[PDB]
């Protein structure tokens, strides 16, 4: 019931007690572990609201106060009457920050308290949504000095009036299938890129075409909008030692901005809540560039290095992987765009974890996602035992809109 | 109940039904995953169900379930239990059992080799000297002049737990580690405590950086005895790099034979507390963990210095750059000396094929992702993108406490 987590590199042991407040289920059972699986009414709503407001007033050292009691009362009133309720701005801000704080797969949570929250609950149209997203992007990019932010659109009602951003990130490159069987651009977006064209997008059929936004307001049909290019800060990729690198023609964007998740606060569901921070180097260089199902350029970089690609045991893949990540980190720092290497980030997360164990009594963490895709065991998170469980408020996954949307 | 696992690189989906035959716990609950946690006297009462369950498996595998041969064996075992509180495995059962323990080892990326395991029955062993001889023969056979062969040696099973056989070493071959007055460490930091135990037990320590530890062997619950493995039986590989001539000057070498000796083999309710098993190394085990862990030989610094990497900011990825060269060197050295070894790309690719095969013919393959995924270059191996189910089948290898923490000293 009270749990121990050991670091095996430093022998340090923390005691987790926060997990006893775990509400949601994990997929796992006493018989089977699923830690590596990617995705496993009025009555319902009242307790959910109470649990939240309780922890809120607790955080502000005003638990059991009349302000607490009165709010619990008032929210209770509003639910019995309207079958839902609205969050005060302070609650909303607390809720968003805490959903990040509870994101077990996020290595960047040491920054959790410095989240800019833009309240877009007054939004009513796709054009209104577009305005808010543009402003989000601009605030967050900040000429390269990136800042964490979330923009929150109206909460779900009867499920027929959902607000959705159909893109998975605010900023991604298009994917096109070629007649010659291969793929141009980003293969991960071939379907979304189809839907865009299917909805009227004029694709320049290039390799790094910033996708248009597809915005759905109030359960309506989704509309297309192009982000002003001047707001999409991109970084050309060069190597600090290999001149030929530039010739590969690689660039990537500076703003990672997740837009398809569902924010749940106090039993309320915010289906459109795009949020952004800044990249860890490996996300781009390792995943985006070198994954087979992506830009998959390892072979090309390897050939320009003239490494022996005759036998896997020359580790040419690994050698190429390193230069590529060296270059990505190099380009961003050169262009003065915020980015963090996997060493510094994981070290930050260790400090954060210790902080959370000390001031909160634990920190839900998912080892499978915290450990970077390269160099895993030379980072301190590798040797860190972690406990995974789900606390609310939270970001949850949600189905792709196109499967759901009644047209 | 069916369970689906997906590969996100290939979209190959698999169905698990094998998890239904799982009985042991995992550590996880509906409200917590402990999947990244490293660690999660038996009566006639629970013993016979365990016996029966095993013998049913065994006779299914040889296509003789429900046979008279099957039934007589059950009644044989039953009577042996109620009259002697334990029972003895036939040799055929012991072999079947050890192979399956490996096959069920959810943390082992090397399980594709599981059917080819030489099993040495050391159950007639009664003394430490007898243990030394068995272990020496295991090492000689397994090493096979560098053309390594998988093997396991099985010593007598636990009885009342007051007469255990144990190998006190964690691996049959390992380098000493000595803590110095100034706080630093000579040798392998992982083995400091064991080295001390040995030294206390009368081992004369050469005190170098690559001293092969002696065997500390407990037979029948008696106090353990020291034995030195004959050096001619200890295959070692000088580490050098194919491009970097200064690399040999680092003075590194490693032993060829990975051989785990502190685990507990459970078959049909029987506990075999001494069961050293060995295979061959995956490159990263040496080049990533043994050399580059902070709490091990920690040569990342020096290698990076000699490559003259930019070590002022970690953003140069000097740590990663050096890590790769060390692993290239480990592979290059073993291959050049014709000592069997596998790189992490070949190993994980093979495990993936094995796994898919296990799903088809067997209905599943329990796998611990946290352990299967290699400790460098993780996402450019196919296992990174593979959803895996973890659960516990028997027979199995279990951890067991260190013997110096439980042993009752005789004198
Ligand atoms: C500020 C710097 C940030 C860094 C360095 C960072 C880093 C990461 C990384 C590396 C992942 C792993 C996902 C993958 O590799 O595919 C991740 C996931 C995640 N991050 Fe953070 N992030 C940052 C900001 C944020 C912010 C501002 C939020 C929310 C307010 C957030 C919420 C999440 C969530 C919910 C996930 C899990 C998403 C999923 O399940 O796919 N992150 N983050
Ligand atoms: C023959 C080639 C083999 C290879 C390449 C191999 C590879 C590995 C690796 C890399 C690990 C994880 C090690 C680590 O944490 O550093 C492992 C774990 C394991 N292997 Fe294998 N192995 C092989 C043979 C065997 C054999 C013959 C057995 C038993 C008969 C076996 C049983 C196990 C067990 C029980 C574990 C879990 C160890 C632990 O929890 O500490 N392996 N294997
Ligand atoms: C804010 C942020 C910063 C950062 N450095 N990295 C990410 C991760 C982006 C990201 C990571 N993993 C899965 C998704 N998807 C969108 C959510 O649904 C699954 C796919 C997105 C997000
Ligand atoms: C047989 C075999 C082959 C191979 N290539 N690699 C290993 C490594 C097994 C291994 C890895 N890590 C810790 C332990 N220990 C044994 C259990 O107790 C802790 C030490 C064992 C074993
Ligand atoms: C905390 C975590 O479980 C621990 O560091 C594990 C992670 N994965 C591992 N994987 C392997 N192969 N070997 C290990 O020792 C570990 N250690
Ligand atoms: C199958 C496996 O769970 C899948 O590849 C996971 C593994 N770990 C990950 N870790 C991060 N950071 N991001 C990911 O997308 C994944 N994918
Ligand atoms: Zn689990």
Curated annotation (Swiss-Prot), chain A:
Binding site for L-arginine: 169, 278-279, 283
Tissue localization of expression: Isoform N-NOS-1 is expressed in brain and colorectum. Found in the Auerbach's plexus of the enteric nervous system. Isoform PNNOS is expressed in the penis, urethra, prostate, and skeletal muscle, and coexists with the cerebellar nnos in the pelvic plexus, bladder and liver, and is detectable in the cerebellum.
Record's keyword terms, sorted: Calmodulin-binding, Cell membrane, Cell projection, FAD, Flavoprotein, FMN, Heme, Iron, Membrane, Metal-binding, NADP, Oxidoreductase, Phosphoprotein, Synapse, Ubl conjugation
PTM annotation, UniProt: Ubiquitinated; mediated by STUB1/CHIP in the presence of Hsp70 and Hsp40 (in vitro).
Superkingdom of origin: Eukaryota
Record localization: Cell membrane, Sarcolemma; Cell projection, Dendritic spine
Signal peptide per UniProt: none
Main location: membrane
One cellular-component annotation, GO: nucleus
UniProt function note: Produces nitric oxide (NO) which is a messenger molecule with diverse functions throughout the body. In the brain and peripheral nervous system, NO displays many properties of a neurotransmitter. Inhibitory transmitter for non-adrenergic and non-cholinergic nerves in the colorectum. Probably has nitrosylase activity and mediates cysteine S-nitrosylation of cytoplasmic target proteins such SRR. Inhibitory transmitter for non-adrenergic and non-cholinergic nerves in the colorectum.
Domain notes: The PDZ domain participates in protein-protein interaction, and is responsible for targeting nNos to synaptic membranes. Mediates interaction with VAC14.
Sequence similarity: Belongs to the NOS family.
Subunit architecture: Homodimer. Interacts with DLG4 (via N-terminal tandem pair of PDZ domains); the interaction possibly being prevented by the association between NOS1 and CAPON. Forms a ternary complex with CAPON and RASD1. Forms a ternary complex with CAPON and SYN1. Interacts with ZDHHC23. Interacts with NOSIP; which may impair its synaptic location. Interacts with HTR4. Interacts with SLC6A4. Interacts with VAC14.
This protein's name: Nitric oxide synthase 1
Gene name as annotated: Nos1
């Amino acid at each position: 019931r009270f749990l121990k987590v050991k670091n095996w590199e430093t022998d340090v042991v923390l005691t987790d007690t926060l997990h006893l407040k775990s509400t949601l289920e994990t997929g796992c059972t006493e018989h089977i572990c699923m830690g590596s699986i990617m995705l496993p009414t009025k009555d319902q709503l009242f307790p959910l609201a109470k649990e939240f407001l309780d922890q809120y007033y607790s955080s502000i050292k005003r638990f059991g106060s009349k302000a607490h009691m009165d709010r619990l009362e008032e929210v209770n009133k509003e639910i019995e009457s309207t079958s839902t309720y609205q969050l005060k701005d302070t609650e909303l801000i607390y809720g968003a920050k805490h959903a990040w704080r509870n994101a077990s797969r996020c290595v960047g949570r040491i920054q959790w308290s410095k989240l800019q929250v833009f309240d877009a609950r007054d939004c009513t149209t796709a054009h209104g949504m577009f305005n808010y997203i543009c402003n989000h992007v601009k605030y967050a990019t900040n000429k390269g000095n990136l800042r964490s932010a979330i923009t929150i659109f109206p909460q779900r009602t009867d499920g027929k009036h959902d607000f959705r951003v159909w893109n998975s990130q605010l900023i991604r490159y298009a994917g096109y299938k070629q007649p010659d069987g291969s793929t141009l651009g980003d293969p991960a977006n071939v379907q979304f890129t189809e839907i865009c064209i299917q909805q009227g997008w004029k694709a320049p059929r290039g390799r790094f075409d910033v996708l248009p936004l597809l915005l759905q307001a109030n359960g309506n049909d989704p509309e297309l909008f192009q982000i002003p290019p001047e707001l999409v800060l991109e970084v050309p990729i060069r190597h600090p030692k290999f001149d030929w690198f530039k010739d590969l023609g690689l660039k990537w964007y500076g703003l990672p901005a997740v837009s398809n998740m569902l924010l749940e606060i106090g039993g309320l569901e915010f289906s459109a809540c795009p949020f952004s921070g800044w990249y860890m180097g490996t996300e781009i260089g390792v995943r985006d560039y070198c994954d087979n199902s992506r830009y998959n350029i390892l072979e090309e970089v390897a050939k320009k290095m003239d490494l022996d690609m005759r036998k896997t045991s020359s580790l040419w893949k690994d050698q190429a992987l390193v230069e590529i990540n060296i270059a990505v980190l190099y380009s961003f720092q050169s262009d003065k765009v915020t980015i963090v290497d996997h060493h510094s980030a994981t070290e930050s997360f260790i400090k954060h974890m210790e902080n959370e164990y000390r001031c909160r009594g634990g920190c839900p963490a998912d080892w499978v996602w915290i450990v970077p895709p390269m160099s895993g065991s030379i980072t301190p998170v590798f040797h860190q035992e972690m406990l995974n469980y789900r606390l609310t408020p939270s970001f949850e996954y949600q189905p792709d809109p196109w499967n759901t949307h009644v047209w």
